[PDB]
């Protein structure tokens, strides 16, 4: 992961979701652009 | 086969054998290397053999490679129109001494505007932005 305080849409396939209380960012292309909380 | 236009290729005219100006040219959006040797050779000896004369090709997988008609070679004979072979080091500010429209007189003679312009006077303004390639401005 990339646990930050500031999660973003780092790419255009990077997508922010809210999964049981935590503001996560999935990326369907690159697993480098995945963040957990912010 | 998927095409998007304006495809660059750096190969010799009339003979598909000299490679290293592009070398291995073809791996991702076209049709392969060695067999371009005949498509150039239904139109020969009127279009400046030897010197560079640039191209926009379009590609087919059906034994056919056909192009965008302009009879008079009018991009590097514009370097011959002024008198250079190496271009200017920066486009349209840094100069060698610019070209005018009275040195566009021989070039606009037989370029056959029917398939590249509207009428013959419109094809004169084709090279009014084609020496807009090489650190020159077309003023007149």
């Amino acid at each position: 992961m990339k646990v930050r305080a500031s999660v973003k849409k780092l790419c255009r396939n990077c997508k922010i979701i809210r999964r049981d209380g935590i503001v996560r960012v999935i990326c369907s292309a690159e697993p480098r652009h995945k963040q957990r909380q912010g | 086969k998927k095409i998007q236009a304006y495809i660059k290729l750096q190969v010799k005219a009339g003979q598909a054998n000299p490679s290293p100006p592009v070398g291995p040219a073809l791996g991702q959006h076209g049709v392969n290397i060695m067999e371009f040797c005949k498509a150039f050779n239904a139109k020969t000896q009127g279009q400046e053999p030897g010197l560079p004369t640039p191209v926009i090709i379009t590609v087919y997988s059906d034994r056919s490679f056909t192009f965008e008609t302009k009879s008079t070679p009018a991009a590097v004979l514009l370097k011959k129109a002024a008198g250079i072979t190496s271009g200017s080091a920066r486009p349209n500010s840094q100069k060698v001494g610019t070209v005018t429209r009275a040195q566009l007189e021989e070039i606009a003679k037989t370029k056959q505007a029917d398939l590249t312009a509207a009428d013959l006077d419109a094809a004169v303004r084709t090279i009014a932005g084609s020496a807009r390639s090489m650190g020159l401005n077309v003023e007149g």
Partner: protein
Amino acid sequence: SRVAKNPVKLPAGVEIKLAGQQLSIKGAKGALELKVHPSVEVIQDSGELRFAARNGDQQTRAMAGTTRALVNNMVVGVSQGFERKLQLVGVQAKGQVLSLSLGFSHPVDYELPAGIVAETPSQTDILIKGIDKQLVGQVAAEIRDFRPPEPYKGKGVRYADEVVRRKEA
């Protein structure tokens, strides 16, 4: 367009058990797929079906929609058998028990529950047959807990599509 607001247009090979409080379905090529329907849902019947909410809160707008798609593949799961083409290296299939060799010095065996069944129609592909997609996708994830795809070369089990992030060293 919203997903529950359109009628289902179901085929006429599957006989429904209209409950109002519940939902049970049955047919040929599979049966026994009853789903306990929740409170905030209406079922309006015709020659086709349609689903609806009850009250203007965003929780049942997610529930009426998830119920039509859960009974979309419950009709189709009795109509057709769900499949997946798991591609790997070496399948020794036997029957209701599955035998595999994924890169280890331990040959791990895997079991198939009731309902589902496993056959090997190709050399090294695994194809699956089941009447509910919830369990069909479940057992294709149970095989990938053994072996993730390697980025550098790629060993063992994959998905059916190819979105595997490959890496060079």
